[PDB]
């Protein structure tokens, strides 16, 4: 291991850089909030009774991205649409999501 030295330590540093890059990419990607909870988000009391019982029906937690939280105007399957302008802001006429011309 001429330069890499400790193989496992070097690979771990590489994975650290990789996860940092993946975070920097995802935070600006077009992910869509996806979770088993749809309308029972808080529901502290009941805590979504229709989850427990199987203990293995856990889905893949996907966080809301920038393009999703920035007043989207649809969903092109699984990602925010890049071909339609968002809706109008009720306060004043405003479209913070525009497709260029």
């Amino acid at each position: 291991n001429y330069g890499r030295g400790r193989e496992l330590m070097y690979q771990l540093e590489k994975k650290g850089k990789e996860i940092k890059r993946d975070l920097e990419k995802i935070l600006l990607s077009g992910q869509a909030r996806t979770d088993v909870l749809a309308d029972q988000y808080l529901t502290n009391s009941a805590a979504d009774p229709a989850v427990a019982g199987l203990n293995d029906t856990h889905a893949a937690r996907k966080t809301g991205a920038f393009q999703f939280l920035c007043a989207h105007g649809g969903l092109a399957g699984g990602v925010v649409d890049k071909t339609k302008n968002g809706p109008a802001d009720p306060d004043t006429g405003a479209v913070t999501v525009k497709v260029a011309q």
Binding site: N44, A46, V51
Partner: protein, 50 residues
């Protein structure tokens, strides 16, 4: 919340590492915050009389 339901026979072997697991959700039941109601509409002649 509760503690358990039944324990009974728990004798096992020194290699019983097959599978296990548990789960118990929150048990918040309810709360109402009841209200009351009482009113009086006496006039002025009555309040003045004796």
């Amino acid at each position: 919340d509760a503690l358990a339901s039944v324990d009974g026979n728990n004798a096992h072997v020194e290699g019983s590492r097959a599978e296990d697991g548990e789960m118990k959700p929150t048990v918040i039941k309810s709360n109402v915050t009841q209200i009351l109601r009482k009113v009086v509409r006496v006039s002025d002649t009555a309040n003045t009389t004796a």
